[PDB]
Amino acid sequence: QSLQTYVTQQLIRAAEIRASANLAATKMSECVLGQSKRVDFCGKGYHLM
Amino acid sequence: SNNSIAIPTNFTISVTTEILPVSMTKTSVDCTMYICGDSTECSNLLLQYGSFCTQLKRALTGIAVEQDKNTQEVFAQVKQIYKTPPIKYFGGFNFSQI
Amino acid sequence: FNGLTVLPPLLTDEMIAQYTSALLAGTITSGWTFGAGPALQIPFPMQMAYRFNGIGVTQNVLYENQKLIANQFNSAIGKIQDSLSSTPSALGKLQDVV
Amino acid sequence: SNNSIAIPTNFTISVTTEILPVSMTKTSVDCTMYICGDSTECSNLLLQYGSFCTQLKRALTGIAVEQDKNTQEVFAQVKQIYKTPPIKYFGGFNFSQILPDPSKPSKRSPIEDLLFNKVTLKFNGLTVLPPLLTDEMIAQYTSALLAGTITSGWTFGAGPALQIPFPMQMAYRFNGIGVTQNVLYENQKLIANQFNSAIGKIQDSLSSTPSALGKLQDVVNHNAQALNTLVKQLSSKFGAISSVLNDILSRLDPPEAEVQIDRLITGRLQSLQTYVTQQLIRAAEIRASANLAATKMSECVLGQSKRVDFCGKGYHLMSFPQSAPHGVVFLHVTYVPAQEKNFTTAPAICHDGKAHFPREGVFVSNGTHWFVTQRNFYEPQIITTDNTFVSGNCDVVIGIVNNTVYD
Amino acid sequence: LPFQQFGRDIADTTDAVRDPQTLEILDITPCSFGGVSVITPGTNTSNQVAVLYQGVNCTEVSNVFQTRAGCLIGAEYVNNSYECDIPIGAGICASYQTSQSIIAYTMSLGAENSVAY
Numbered sequence: 001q002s003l004q005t006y007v008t009q010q011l012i013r014a015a016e017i018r019a020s021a022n023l024a025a026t027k028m029s030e031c032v033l034g035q036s037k038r039v040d041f042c043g044k045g046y047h048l049m
Numbered sequence: 050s051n052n053s054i055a056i057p058t059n060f061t062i063s064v065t066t067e068i069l070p071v072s073m074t075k076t077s078v079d080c081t082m083y084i085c086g087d088s089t090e091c092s093n094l095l096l097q098y099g100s101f102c103t104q105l106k107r108a109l110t111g112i113a114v115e116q117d118k119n120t121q122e123v124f125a126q127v128k129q130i131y132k133t134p135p136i137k138y139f140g141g142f143n144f145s146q147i
Numbered sequence: 148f149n150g151l152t153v154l155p156p157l158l159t160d161e162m163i164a165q166y167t168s169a170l171l172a173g174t175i176t177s178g179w180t181f182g183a184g185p186a187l188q189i190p191f192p193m194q195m196a197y198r199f200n201g202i203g204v205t206q207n208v209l210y211e212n213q214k215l216i217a218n219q220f221n222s223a224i225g226k227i228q229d230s231l232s233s234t235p236s237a238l239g240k241l242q243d244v245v
Numbered sequence: 246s247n248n249s250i251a252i253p254t255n256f257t258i259s260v261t262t263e264i265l266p267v268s269m270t271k272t273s274v275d276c277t278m279y280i281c282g283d284s285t286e287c288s289n290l291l292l293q294y295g296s297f298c299t300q301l302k303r304a305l306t307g308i309a310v311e312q313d314k315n316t317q318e319v320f321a322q323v324k325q326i327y328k329t330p331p332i333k334y335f336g337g338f339n340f341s342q343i344l345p346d347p348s349k350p351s352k353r354s355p356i357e358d359l360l361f362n363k364v365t366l367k368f369n370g371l372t373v374l375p376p377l378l379t380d381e382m383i384a385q386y387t388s389a390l391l392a393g394t395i396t397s398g399w400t401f402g403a404g405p406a407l408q409i410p411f412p413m414q415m416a417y418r419f420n421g422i423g424v425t426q427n428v429l430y431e432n433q434k435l436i437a438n439q440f441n442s443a444i445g446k447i448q449d450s451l452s453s454t455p456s457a458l459g460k461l462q463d464v465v466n467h468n469a470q471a472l473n474t475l476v477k478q479l480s481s482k483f484g485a486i487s488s489v490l491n492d493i494l495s496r497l498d499p500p501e502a503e504v505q506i507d508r509l510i511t512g513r514l515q516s517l518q519t520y521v522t523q524q525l526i527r528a529a530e531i532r533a534s535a536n537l538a539a540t541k542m543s544e545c546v547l548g549q550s551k552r553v554d555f556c557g558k559g560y561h562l563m564s565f566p567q568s569a570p571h572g573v574v575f576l577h578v579t580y581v582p583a584q585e586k587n588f589t590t591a592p593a594i595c596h597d598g599k600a601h602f603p604r605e606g607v608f609v610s611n612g613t614h615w616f617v618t619q620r621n622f623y624e625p626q627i628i629t630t631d632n633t634f635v636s637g638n639c640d641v642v643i644g645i646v647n648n649t650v651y652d
Numbered sequence: 653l654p655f656q657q658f659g660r661d662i663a664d665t666t667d668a669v670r671d672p673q674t675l676e677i678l679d680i681t682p683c684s685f686g687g688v689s690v691i692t693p694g695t696n697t698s699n700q701v702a703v704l705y706q707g708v709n710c711t712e713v714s715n716v717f718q719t720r721a722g723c724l725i726g727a728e729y730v731n732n733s734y735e736c737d738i739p740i741g742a743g744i745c746a747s748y749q750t751s752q753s754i755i756a757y758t759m760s761l762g763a764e765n766s767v768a769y
């Protein structure tokens with residue numbers, strides 16, 4: 001039971017970290033490799049780089 | 050007002066920081082070692098329960114491979130490894146900190 | 148521990164640093180061109196003028212105020228170091244994960 | 246360098262493939278049948294254990310409805326079913342591989358047929374529910390999206406479908422990526438040939454590497470594995486005397502048989518709970534993927550996206566959806582600059598004591614003369630007052646060069 | 653084989669048995685089981701219902717219709733297609749339409765419109 005609880009909690013945290021990693025990849029593609037016109041996606045203000 | 054507008058006469062260049070997690074520690078658990086240690090009697094008793102340990106192993110291996118894939122996806126955007134010129138003059142812009 | 152092992156990540160910190168350096172060198176020397184294809188070198192003031200046109204401001208604003216923009220960017224980059232150093236909680240999310 | 250720029254002199258039309266899972270297999274469980282089979286003695290104790298069976302049934306029903314909703318979100322964006330014109334001439338662009346093939350009985354495109362062939366995707370109370378939308382209906386949605394994109398561009402996404410010649414649509418997409426219309430119209434045959442060759446290479450690329458579709462297969466495999474595991478879990482004894490309930494009932498006294506039946510019930514209920522939790526997590530992952538696919542359909546297929554690397558690698562021109570078993574394959578047509586040339590660039594041109602900046606493009610020197618060129622393509626023009634604006638004096642700008650501006 | 657007496661599949665369930673008296677291999681199929689769904693318009697509207705036996709062929713089970721989802725009793729198949737009201741299964745939806753009864757139909761994806769390219 002202890003191992004099952006550990007594995008389930010780890011799976012949920014892995015899903016959360018995967019969402020964060022996908023957001024980071026999107027930011028790297030848009031904020032870093034380009035200029036983003038999406039508001040508040042790349043910092044606060046008018047995004048330069 | 051229906052005849053009043055506000056226009057900025059100056060600007061500010063602002064640098065902000067955004068911190069994003071990408072990967073978490075990869076853990077592997079030996080089901081037999083944790084549940085039963087070195088006891089053979091406990092291992093034989095545990096084998097009756099089924100394939101729980103195999104499912105645990107598959108889940109944890111999937112998580113570890115997922116962490117590696119996360120780091121690859123975030124940081125491997127560029128195929129080429131670019132190098133800045135030795136002369137670090139970029140129009141007065143100082144990038145020494147980064 | 149007891150069957151609980153931590154597996155080292157595939158990419159070491161040095162390799163992630165090299166990816167970050169490659170991205171920085173690309174975005175400094177080539178602009179956004181290396182993301183969408185071949186890396187096309189461009190003077191950095193001209194790249195920042197491109198970006199100013201991107202946000203709706205003409206090129207003359209940057210070229211006339213180049214020194215002021217450079218000073219503002221340098222001051223902001225300098226303040227980023229102090230802002231990160233003073234407050235550990237700025238990194239808390241990462242720490243939270245661990 | 247202070248004065249060095251690199252301007253492309255050619256382009257490549259590249260078609261890339263993105264595979265995204267959309268739905269996972271919908272499964273239903275009969276808790277009494279799985280835990281107890283046909284034994285009433287087990288059923289009586291299962292009734293005592295509580296409302297776990299109802300919770301598991303509700304969770305699985307929610308997962309199934311979620312899968313159906315994912316499919317409708319991804320594919321049912323088009324309000325009306327659009328049909329490609331009977332005469333399929335689209336300016337030299339050749340959509341035979343992505344358009345439906347009437348000869349095929351399935352009414353599916355060659356790429357869709359290859360995808361369906363590549364991935365082909367026990368009864369102890371476990372059932373598999375068919376999806377609400379058949380593969381034919383998803384194919385009809387995909388054909389409608391393709392017809393709308395080809396005939397109307399992005400107008401059908403944001404309102405009534407508006408007719409437009411395909412070359413004009415490509416010209417406006419070039420204007421979107423920052424390249425003038427003359428580049429398309431002068432080089433129409435080359436761009437059509439590049440698109441045709443890339444579309445032809447897509448099929449061979451998909452056929453060569455099965456791992457490209459592996460994601461979809463992985464989904465299917467996971468489901469199978471889970472179900473198989475659950476069935477095998479009936480063979481386990483879970484601390485009881487035997488897995489078969491009839492053997493326990495016949496061999497032992499009733500009061501002793503109660504504890505063995507309780508152990509088996511606890512083990513099988515735990516197995517079913519583990520299965521349901523695992524599919525809840527997997528359904529969350531598939532829902533994230535399906536939301537991403539719906540966003541891509543809205544932004545890549547129904548419009549032109551300025552987001553970098555969201556719709557292929559390069560400058561996004563357009564996208565085409567294709568149905569696949571339990572997923573969607575996006576063909577991203579993108580513009581990639583090529584054959585770069587070095588040039589000397591200056592921020593401004595000083596003439597008659599006044600600075601001059603380019604309205605669009607940058608200043609380029611071939612070693613002796615100065616021109617204005619657009620950013621993403623090398624088309625030099627003479628510097629004139631029409632393509633320059635003065636805006637300032639000569640002294641302030643750093644790197645200004647002296648040259649004439651014709652009028 | 654002569655010494656073998658039972659047969660098991662990949663899921664470790666019995667699928668064939670050798671008859672002890674006369675040597676004959678008999679395959680075992682699990683007896684038919686399936687969920688039962690009640691297709692209902694709102695009880696405010698009517699009390700008539702349809703019954704869908706999911707995955708059960710209509711032989712094992714006042715109009716009977718066989719669809720991929722299962723066997724549907726109490727709904728009449730209509731050739732004309734409407735927008736989906738109550739989803740049933742593989743492209744078949746049920747509705748309460750006017751006497752006044754429950755109809756089952758292949759759902760219509762949408763209106764057909766050919767753009768004048």
Ligand SMILES: *[C@@H]1O[C@H](CO)[C@@H](O)[C@H](O)[C@H]1NC(C)=O
Binds near residue numbers: 051052
């Ligand atoms: C603004 O609105 C007021 C009404 O409150 C009106 O009297 C006035 O003429 C308007 N101004 C202009 C410039 O239209």
Ligand SMILES: *[C@@H]1O[C@H](CO)[C@@H](O)[C@H](O)[C@H]1NC(C)=O
Binds near residue numbers: 059060
């Ligand atoms: C804009 O702000 C800077 C200081 O950040 C100052 O030196 C400059 O004179 C200001 N410009 C105007 C238009 O007041």
Ligand SMILES: *[C@@H]1O[C@H](CO)[C@@H](O)[C@H](O)[C@H]1NC(C)=O
Binds near residue numbers: 143145
């Ligand atoms: C950049 O800033 C650092 C201090 O952070 C300074 O030491 C260095 O000289 C600066 N760069 C140049 C080229 O002056």
Ligand SMILES: *[C@@H]1O[C@H](CO)[C@@H](O)[C@H](O)[C@H]1NC(C)=O
Binds near residue numbers: 246
């Ligand atoms: C040209 O680049 C060199 C780099 O060595 C730099 O020292 C010089 O200041 C630059 N010229 C101008 C006008 O900025």
Ligand SMILES: *[C@@H]1O[C@H](CO)[C@@H](O)[C@H](O)[C@H]1NC(C)=O
Binds near residue numbers: 254256
């Ligand atoms: C661009 O590449 C194509 C393919 O080889 C070639 O035929 C064409 O001449 C090139 N364009 C120019 C301007 O050279």
Ligand SMILES: *[C@@H]1O[C@H](CO)[C@@H](O)[C@H](O)[C@H]1NC(C)=O
Binds near residue numbers: 442444
């Ligand atoms: C182009 O169209 C013809 C039919 O007109 C077809 O035979 C050929 O395979 C197509 N080529 C492609 C899709 O590259």
Ligand SMILES: *[C@@H]1O[C@H](CO)[C@@H](O)[C@H](O)[C@H]1NC(C)=O
Binds near residue numbers: 613
């Ligand atoms: C630069 O372009 C001009 C105008 O097309 C031409 O006369 C001149 O020969 C070119 N110089 C070189 C070095 O190509």
Ligand SMILES: *[C@@H]1O[C@H](CO)[C@@H](O)[C@H](O)[C@H]1NC(C)=O
Binds near residue numbers: 595645646647
């Ligand atoms: C034109 O610009 C060049 C570039 O430095 C300069 O040497 C020259 O003196 C300028 N001519 C005039 C008349 O100012």
Ligand SMILES: *[C@@H]1O[C@H](CO)[C@@H](O)[C@H](O)[C@H]1NC(C)=O
Binds near residue numbers: 709710711
């Ligand atoms: C049901 O049984 C009949 C027997 O005649 C058969 O024709 C039909 O295909 C069966 N339907 C299904 C769904 O198995």
